[PDB]
Amino acid sequence: CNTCPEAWIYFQKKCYYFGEGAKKWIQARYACENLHGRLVSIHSPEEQDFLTKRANWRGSWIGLRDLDIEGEFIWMDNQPLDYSNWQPGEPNDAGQGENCVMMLGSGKWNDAFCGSELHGWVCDRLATC
Ligand SMILES: CO[C@H]1O[C@H](CO)[C@@H](O)[C@H](O)[C@@H]1O
Ligand SMILES: [Ca+2]
Ligand SMILES: [Ca+2]
Structure with missing residues (x-):
């Protein structure tokens, strides 16, 4: 079962959407839901590697x-x-509070x-059959 909706990308049982366009974190939450997914959840080094290689160089939610x-x-x-990829020193709750996570x-x-x-x-979904 490795089928994904049009415009989504398959990797290891999941489908990924590389969204583009300026959004605050909550706006990105709802943008993913509008596409019937959710902002991506990351649970292994292999999944992180897939994302790192494809990530937006200006940063992404x-x-x-x-x-x-x-x-x-x-x-x-x-x-x-169960898996983390924090930049050294992060999370640091800088400013007067940082509560939403991005990839650099x-x-x-x-x-x-x-x-x-x-x-x-970035959004994800489970792959279908
Ligand atoms: C000063 O704040 C900025 O830089 C630090 C790292 O230096 C980050 O932790 C923070 O989220 C901001 O991006
Ligand atoms: Ca920070
Ligand atoms: Ca915080």
Whole structure:
């Protein structure tokens, strides 16, 4: 079962959407839902490698946030915190608070101001048959 909707990209049981266009994190959440997916959740080095190689060099939102309880990150897929790719020193909750996670151009993760208008955002879905 490796079928994905038109414009999505298949990798290891999942489908990925490389969205482009300036969006705050919440806007990217709903942009993914409009396409019947969610902001991407990442659970292995192989999945991260797929994303790193394809990531927007200006940065992109992923489906990870600590809005509800500071320091408690939650994935869009509600699965465990079982794989990380933090940029060294991140997350750092800089400014007066950074509660939404992005990939840098290198694929490394950074917590950012949720109102930042990033030019990329990545969604996922399970592949169908
Ligand atoms: C100063 O804030 C910026 O740079 C640091 C890293 O230096 C990040 O943690 C932060 O999210 C911002 O991108
Ligand atoms: Ca935070
Ligand atoms: Ca940060």
